Amino acid sequence: SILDIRQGPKEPFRDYVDRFYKTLRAEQASQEVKNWMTETLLVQNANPDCKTILKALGPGATLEEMMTACQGVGGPGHKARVLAEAMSQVTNT
């Protein structure tokens, strides 16, 4: 079931997408439901960091935008960026 495809804490987002769509191509649902799955279920089953970024992208983001947005998750640049964002929020408050 597509509902069982969940992104691991350190799984690259592109591999998660690969598994998700391999299971999706076999799911017995209409193209409307499958569109909802690529739009909402894909984001909901991502790991916390990727899910935060995707949520920040807002509705209507294309698959390519999502894959680009989560490319660096788990790396030093991502950690430093989150820390910088937190520092910025404490400063702005």
Residue 29 interacting with its own copies (CB under 8 A): yes
- By CB under 8 A, is residue 30 in contact with its own copies? yes
CB of 88 to its own copies, least distance (A): 28
| Tokens found for residue 76 | 């030093």
User: C-beta of 21: minimal distance to its own copies in Å?
Assistant: 18
Q: What count of residues does the chain have? A: 93
- Is 80 near its own copies (CB under 8 A)? no
DSSP 20: H
Task: Determine the Cα–Cα distance for residues 62 and 91; give it in Å rounded to an integer.
Answer: 33
> Per the structure block, which two tokens stand in for 40?
């909402």
- For position 62 contacting its own copies by CB under 8 A, the verdict is no
> Does residue 68 belong to the site contacting its own copies (CB under 8 A)?
no
Burial class (CB within 10 angstroms; exposed 0-12, middle 13-18, buried 19+) of 11: middle
Q: By the criterion CB under 8 A, which residues form the site for its own copies?
A: 1, 3-4, 29-30, 32-33, 36, 40-41, 44-45
